[PDB]
């Protein structure tokens, strides 16, 4: 009997209240800023580069992605802000690469396309990190990988940050080989001239598609060949579609132009013989009972004020139906069961400072979810220590670790969304980036750092004064003030959401109004892989 | 995410090609830019008997017509007139 | 075979190690060079290669000159028949 | 019948030759420099810090490690040069942490000890990377982890580098929990004050040992008698180490080997001749067969496909009775060499034999004819074969390592169990001088396309910075300052290091190998 | 989005061309000959034997099969030409046994029925081979076996050929027991007298049905009421068949498919044009793409590596909504063709897609340059790739099949699920004229070595017997008289036969494929 | 075979012998040139080991 009436979460906010108006204004300003910056990034490498790229007859990378995916299907771009002001004077819109998840021939696939307009497709360190993150996502979710290869190889300056280390360029080929061995299809479309690094990608791919004239695969370019051995040869002769298709045999398909290559890619994906099957139960999808745009007023942009996470939950779950678990024990943490687009999910949100009871409750809920094979969703809003200096945090250590372990050992799909501050060990406890969530997103008003700037400033001043006192050097009172002002500024700049998004941490920033859609797409993508059994370590106590 | 998707499609009217830029609005309507003019279009397909009909509103003007898509030609049948549009064939 | 006798029985004509530039030549048009004497030094890749005389006979001719390109496994020093 | 006589590799070098003398002199100078730098690093954080640490009653970290391991057992320290000149003005001897593999109660274990004398034990980014590398090694080889802890917590300067990243200071806890789940033991001794929130490291450990007064996971008395976090109470450092040895003895673990074993025999030639044989100049070429003959048991080597793709050397040998498949570089890589290496890797994976790579690579052969014959195709399938291999892989860089050749010969990105480099090695994307020619040509051509003029003097001036920068980045010390390449090693100790590494790596069972599509 | 328009293979042949008319005439003559011979074979053992069999009250075996299977369901008979002129003076229509695959109670089952009219049901060696082949097919495809039994036991003449060998008349019982162990059902109906010790066949069966008076396992009354060997008692043939249908219905089996399915669409061109396209002359060459276009759903084909090794055709298509990988011959095999085939086979095995081979092979390219480039090496790895494949493999021989090309393209020795040949096929170790030249040269050289003289006339006379003998052995009927090649098929029915074969073969799950060493 | 050993002169690996090659395509070639220990070890790469004689 599924009729059973059930109470629904959420309440109607007071629109007339001045606090709601101010929060809405601040959030709207932040969202407008984000939208305009994303537009500028989407503009591309530049006008002259785009003109040259079009003159060569090629398609712009976004046009390639639009033509590749199924008509009208949504596209979930990842890390749109990678490289945003990362380097002092060089502009790298989007990191020089485009990654996302879309549906090709009815199959969800991960797409990686190089933007030839940005430095001729050269690989910056951030580009390598972004590509590695996309490959890791695809491997974890068992998604086929499609590469639209048009690159000039590694950026010759800054080679030390791209070539040598484990998470450097070679990890790309390593991941390609591993995923091929694990029956995850690899498809490479050589849409333009590659290089030594670019050449290896089509070789390791299961299927290759190379354009007749623009596509050129050479293990070493003409300039590189001349530098290495003093040999002169034309680009087409050294590497070309006809040569690779007919004599060398590297190419697997021959394409007349970009549109033909995309059509061939769609056909190849069609002939994959893959069917998606779900393990979790499904129910009809229902929309939430409250508008999503009220989240602007509810949350605002000031981290000092506190908001009930139950409102956020009620505005993003199917029908605003929530089954709270252990409501009155450790009330600073909110846990319960809900469904997003018919998918069962276990929601773990922050409502205040973490205590021993909250940690135990979270551990219990995580164990339940792992036992029942239910995906987990974390909403992080860790609180500053302005309210409580210490609160005998030693008690928290004994129990915080229980949650950190339980979260780490979980094998169910985990998605983390940072709606507010995320500091200290609370970030680790609530499925931080280091604990391998399937996806991680942040709202435009989030702040992340080891501790708040004010708290950090006080700690540094005290340590220096005590050490100086043992040394016998007087520590000036004015010096303590002098140290504090720069530290506060540095922490604020570093904690910015754009600072974290420029580095490949925290994937991309998302408008709060689109949280439900983003979560639905992410869970639908992550459900491709089967859910394995979970093995836990030794729970202390 | 944070952008509006615009689709470039080419439709051959008679002997002259026409390029249309279609924008997928969040609300479900479409904004089509043809030459220097923009139109706000929304509609749906409902089937009566074995015939499929298209009910749509263009810039606040609503109309209904029978829609037939055979080969690379689109047939729009209505009391006002009949329209044939040819979808270009990839080389 | 234990005494490495079969190891000795190996011979072949001089050839270019790979495709690259010949930096200099130690063998003139007509000269008497014992086996192992350097004929040319070639730099096609990061490394450098010195060509030793396959046989002690006089060199008949020099096919390549400094700054030129020598294809892979192509003769460089022609040896007069004995 | 194992009595059949087998020919032995190697030959006696000419000591009187001037080339041998020069190479020996250069290698001896390099080794002396390395030894003196290692001595200075071993000195520790500083005199005042060491005096304060001793005054507190604690033991120095190296003394702790010496007392922890079995008497006389060798200790294999890892990444001794981490943080060497990594930061502009701050000195971080050894990265602030000490990691290595030693035998405790007859069991090989990975030991991670914080050096409290260096910045009070604060974690620099290099320290986090070193600890993560040690944890990854232990997880791969299924070695119990012992964490002597004296940490001041994250270094507040450069906080963004260490606290937030996935591979940065949160992974240390994640690895500890996963190792416990897989039954790899995790044991933590709090020999020093955990002023920061490092209390998590003992809490997540299966067993804790905390010293009575120095240990402060915030009171040792509060923790030992009330919090219960402590599973053992130790009077001082020596008592804590004794308790750790007892705890390790109570692990109920027995090492079992899958590979066959044979009696060990020493090589037929002295190891110190490698100095003269190899020298310090990368331009000259040396036969890798000499190096193989000076590091294998009895100098016995069974070459495989000797006359096909002779630029690559492959064969079977035994080190300390352990079967091994040796893959060495003797010149530029070609299609035949790549195919031969693929064939050998497939054989080794099928027979479950550990692989050893000796890198002297200078790049992949490039040319129109070579591109016609799919040199890139052979490189890729050879690389794939290396990546998909599941047998223990150990890589040693005895010379240059550039371009895709580094990836082909089991580079750092392909997860070898261990990686070592000799003092003469240089690692870069491409050679410095060639790198210079490539950049100048692209800029000159771009100017020609836009109608701009590129001055000949400007192009040459652009090349000179590139030449100097490439040399500095390639220096072995620069690579080992970062955690790439584990530790620089003395060529005379190569056999011992390889034996210890293989003995440690044989703890884990050898799994089956699954290969991807072989592009024919 | 599966709408994506896709180009279709095939072209309209020129009906007015004289070559088309001649090829059509020859193929029509061959097909008419095949049909008339099949009719005569279907006639049965003889008029007197049939009259006696009917007088006994029993049903003819074909009537039994017709009544057993579901109404209107197609029946796929196998090896209709077994024993055709195999023995000098004895006629054995159909080998004395009838085997095929049909649907009983909605379940595909393998049916083996003895023809009592042929020598009283005695087992000739060809009969044993045919039954063993049917049992092997059923075991591979996990099909329930139904054995209508009317056997007179081993034919005493040629007893040494059938009773003693491992693959001879003792294997029939072994297969029955193994199939029962693997849960593949074994059901036996004794519709006729088991005069000999054929009592074992019902006893080893899981379920037995014995007719009241005709059926003996030595008395039906003794066996049914007392021996208990009988699990079911039937009044006559119709009752026995009804009981068999009920027993099959009580099997509790459900067929489940692993491969994806799509709606079925007919090919865009008529099948009867294959007569003109292919003809009957093996010297002329035809494009295999026409044959592919006339037998695939919608004539949709996705070629793989079209321009590399063009003598071999590979791609993806669907037959009756079943994905398939087609590998066809368009000329002499070369190194590039072998590599392309190996790559395609690896892809198909990885994706778990059934493979279909179309054989028009004339041998492997031979030459000094070809030997230099390892033509034998590439042939070996394709031979290996084909052998190690675990996906369902079906081979169809549309033309010549000689030399190692037969082994490369999934010959009978490599265990394809089914093998069929068209009427124009010729199979031999090499072409007869070519064999002739080779034998004469060896003998002439041997005489020269010993100082003997070989006459030119004698060498030519030696060649003539070889030419005639090779043609007789290559004839399709000669191969199908032995159980090699299953049954000769009408090219117009190729699509239906392939669909039925794949539907039957999809019953068993598809296992993982493990490959040996790829000799790169 | 996983591993091959071919004798220097007696061992000769040809996919088709000289008489067979002549019959198939009318090509004349010596047995050693078409297939031999040195050729297979050095150029074709089929051979994995090179042996002087039977005992080796
Ligand atoms: C994996 C391993 C193990 C090893 C390797 O991979 S070693 C790879 C060696 N790379 C090459 O061998 C490619 C050399 N390029 C070329 O052959 C071409 O250039 C193309 C192919 C890139 C197409 O580009 P293009 O020629 O059509 O246009 P261009 O404007 O010239 O393109 C931008 C211009 O490239 C300059 N530029 C700066 N850094 C690089 C860089 N790293 N690679 C290429 N170009 C770079 C940029 O500074 C300038 O523009 P700018 O900054 O002055 O405005
Ligand atoms: C995991 C997460 C999620 C979060 C965290 O972990 S947030 C951790 C916050 N840390 C603390 O809360 C420990 C604060 N220390 C102390 O309470 C003590 O200091 C001890 C315990 C360190 C013992 O050391 P000590 O007191 O015995 O000696 P001291 O010489 O004073 O030791 C060296 C002096 O420490 C200075 N120093 C610089 N950076 C740091 C740093 N990061 N931590 C500690 N000290 C630092 C150094 O600059 C000076 O010497 P110098 O450089 O001037 O010569
Ligand atoms: C498995 C192991 C380990 C061991 C064994 O299995 S040891 C089995 C020993 N067999 C018997 O013990 C059965 C003896 N038959 C009979 O008891 C009956 O005969 C029946 C039952 C066969 C029904 O047949 P039937 O009696 O109704 O008619 P009939 O015309 O007589 O049938 C044809 C006539 O049988 C002659 N004929 C030739 N060869 C045989 C043969 N091998 N078996 C039977 N008959 C044969 C045929 O030559 C003649 O006709 P022809 O050739 O002259 O025209
Ligand atoms: O060490 C000198 C040459 C190394 C780089 C040569 C180029 S760079 C990448 C490509 N792959 C190689 O191994 N060689 C070429
Ligand atoms: O059909 C013609 C026979 C050619 C194949 C016979 C085998 S295949 C390999 C070997 N080479 C030949 O020419 N004959 C044999």
From Swiss-Prot, chain A:
One Gene Ontology CC term in the entry: cytosol
SUPFAM superfamilies membership: ClpP/crotonase
Result of altering residue 330 to R: In MCC2D; produces severely decreased wild-type residual activity
Residue ranges annotated for the CoA carboxyltransferase N-terminal domain, each copy included: 27-284
Location of region: Acyl-CoA binding: 321-350
Record annotation: effect of changing residue 412 to L: In MCC2D; has some wild-type residual activity
Region (Carboxyltransferase): 27-533
Pathway assignment: Amino-acid degradation; L-leucine degradation; (S)-3-hydroxy-3-methylglutaryl-CoA from 3-isovaleryl-CoA: step 2/3
Molecular-function annotations in GO: ATP binding; methylcrotonoyl-CoA carboxylase activity
InterPro entries (alphabetical): AcCoA_carboxyl_beta, ClpP/crotonase-like_dom_sf, COA_CT_C, COA_CT_N, MCCB/AccD1-like
Biological process per Gene Ontology, one example term: branched-chain amino acid catabolic process
Gene3D superfamilies, per database record: 2-enoyl-CoA Hydratase, Chain A, domain 1 (3.90.226.10)
Impact noted for substituting residue 141 to D: In MCC2D; uncertain significance
Outcome following mutation: residue 124 to N: In MCC2D; has some wild-type residual activity
Domain CoA carboxyltransferase C-terminal: 287-533
Stated role: Carboxyltransferase subunit of the 3-methylcrotonyl-CoA carboxylase, an enzyme that catalyzes the conversion of 3-methylcrotonyl-CoA to 3-methylglutaconyl-CoA, a critical step for leucine and isovaleric acid catabolism.
Subunit structure comment from the entry: Probably a dodecamer composed of six biotin-containing alpha subunits (MCCC1) and six beta (MCCC2) subunits.
Illness the protein is tied to: 3-methylcrotonoyl-CoA carboxylase 2 deficiency: An autosomal recessive disorder of leucine catabolism. The phenotype is variable, ranging from neonatal onset with severe neurological involvement to asymptomatic adults. There is a characteristic organic aciduria with massive excretion of 3-hydroxyisovaleric acid and 3-methylcrotonylglycine, usually in combination with a severe secondary carnitine deficiency.
Protein name: Methylcrotonoyl-CoA carboxylase beta chain, mitochondrial
Species assigned in the record: Homo sapiens (Human)
Curated annotation (Swiss-Prot), chain C:
PTM annotation, UniProt: Acetylated.
Subcellular locations according to the entry: Mitochondrion matrix
Domain Biotinyl-binding: 8-80
Record PTM N6-biotinyllysine, positions in chain: 46
Subunit structure: Probably a dodecamer composed of six biotin-containing alpha subunits (MCCC1) and six beta (MCCC2) subunits. Interacts (via the biotin carboxylation domain) with SIRT4.
Disease: 3-methylcrotonoyl-CoA carboxylase 1 deficiency: An autosomal recessive disorder of leucine catabolism. The phenotype is variable, ranging from neonatal onset with severe neurological involvement to asymptomatic adults. There is a characteristic organic aciduria with massive excretion of 3-hydroxyisovaleric acid and 3-methylcrotonylglycine, usually in combination with a severe secondary carnitine deficiency.
Biological role stated in the UniProt entry: Biotin-attachment subunit of the 3-methylcrotonyl-CoA carboxylase, an enzyme that catalyzes the conversion of 3-methylcrotonyl-CoA to 3-methylglutaconyl-CoA, a critical step for leucine and isovaleric acid catabolism.
Protein name: Methylcrotonoyl-CoA carboxylase subunit alpha, mitochondrial
The species this protein was found in: Homo sapiens
Whole-protein residues included: 636 to 717 of 725
């Amino acid at each position: 009997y599924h009729g059973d009436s059930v109470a629904s979460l959420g309440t109607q906010p007071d629109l007339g209240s001045a606090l709601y108006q101010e929060n809405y204004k601040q959030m709207k300003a932040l969202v407008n800023q984000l939208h305009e910056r994303v537009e500028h990034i989407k503009l591309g490498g530049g006008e002259k580069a785009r003109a040259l790229h079009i003159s060569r007859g090629k398609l712009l990378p976004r046009e390639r992605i639009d033509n590749l995916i199924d008509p009208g299907s949504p596209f979930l771009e990842l890390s749109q802000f990678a490289g945003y002001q990362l380097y002092d004077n060089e502009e790298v819109p989007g990191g020089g690469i485009i990654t996302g998840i879309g549906r090709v021939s009815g199959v969800e696939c991960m797409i990686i396309a190089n933007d030839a307009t940005v430095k001729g497709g050269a690989y910056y360190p951030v580009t390598v990190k972004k590509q590695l993150r996309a490959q890791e996502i695809a491997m974890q979710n068992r998604l086929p990988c499609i590469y639209l290869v048009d690159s000039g190889g590694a950026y010759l300056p800054r080679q030390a940050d791209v070539f040598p280390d484990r998470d450097h360029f070679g990890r790309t080929f390593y991941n390609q080989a591993i995923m091929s061995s694990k029956n995850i299809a690899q498809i490479a479309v050589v849409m333009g001239s590659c290089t030594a690094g670019g050449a290896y990608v089509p070789a390791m791919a299961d299927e290759n598609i190379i354009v007749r004239k623009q596509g050129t695969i050479f293990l070493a370019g003409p300039p590189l060949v001349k530098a290495a051995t003093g040999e002169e040869v034309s680009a087409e002769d050294l590497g070309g579609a006809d040569l690779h298709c007919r004599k060398s045999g590297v190419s697997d398909h021959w394409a007349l132009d970009d549109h033909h290559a995309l059509h061939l890619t769609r056909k190849v994906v069609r002939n994959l013989n893959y069917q998606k099957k779900l393990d979790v139960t499904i129910e009809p999808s229902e929309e939430p009972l409250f508008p999503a745009d009220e989240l602007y007023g509810i949350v605002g942009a000031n981290l000092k004020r506190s908001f009930d996470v139950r409102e956020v939950i009620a505005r993003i779950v199917d029908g605003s139906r929530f089954t709270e678990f252990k409501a009155f024990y450790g009330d600073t943490l909110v846990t319960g069961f809900a469904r997003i687009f018919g998918y069962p999910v276990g929601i773990v949100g922050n409502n205040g400072v973490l205590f021993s009871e909250s940690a135990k409750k979270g551990t219990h809920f995580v164990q339940l979810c792992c036992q029942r094979n239910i995906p987990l969703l974390f909403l992080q809003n860790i609180t500053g220590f302005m309210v409580g200096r210490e609160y005998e945090a030693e008690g928290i250590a004994k129990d915080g670790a229980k949650m950190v372990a339980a979260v780490a050992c979980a094998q169910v799909p985990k998605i983390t969304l940072i709606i507010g501050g995320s500091y200290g060990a609370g970030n680790y406890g609530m499925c931080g980036r280091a604990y391998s969530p399937r996806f991680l997103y942040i709202w435009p008003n989030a702040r992340i750092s080891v501790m708040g700037g004010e708290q950090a400033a006080n700690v540094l001043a005290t340590i220096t004064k005590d050490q100086r006192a043992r040394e016998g050097k007087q520590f000036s009172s004015a010096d303590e003030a002098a140290l504090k002002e720069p530290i506060i500024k540095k922490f604020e700049e570093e904690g910015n959401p754009y600072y974290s998004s420029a580095r490949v941490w925290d994937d991309g920033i998302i408008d709060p109004a689109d949280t439900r859609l983003v979560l639905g797409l992410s869970f639908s993508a992550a459900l491709n892989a089967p859910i394995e059994k979970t093995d836990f370590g030794i729970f202390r106590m | 995410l944070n952008i509006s998707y615009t689709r470039n499609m080419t439709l051959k009217d008679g002997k002259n090609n026409v390029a249309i830029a279609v924008t997928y609005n969040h609300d479900g309507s479409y904004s089509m830019q043809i030459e220097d003019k923009t139109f706000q279009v929304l509609g749906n397909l409902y089937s009566e008997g074995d015939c499929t009909y298209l009910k749509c509103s263009v810039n606040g003007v609503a109309s209904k017509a029978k829609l037939i898509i055979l080969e690379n030609t689109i047939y729009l049948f209505s009391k006002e007139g009949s329209i044939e549009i040819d979808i270009p064939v990839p080389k | 075979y234990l005494s490495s006798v079969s190891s000795q029985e190996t011979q072949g004509g001089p050839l270019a190690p790979m495709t690259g530039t010949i930096e200099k030549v130690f063998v003139k048009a007509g000269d008497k060079v014992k086996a192992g004497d350097s004929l040319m030094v070639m730099i096609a890749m990061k490394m450098e290669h010195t060509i030793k005389s396959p046989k002690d006979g006089t060199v008949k001719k020099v096919f390549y000159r400094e700054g030129a390109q020598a294809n892979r496994h192509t003769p460089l020093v022609e040896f007069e028949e004995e």
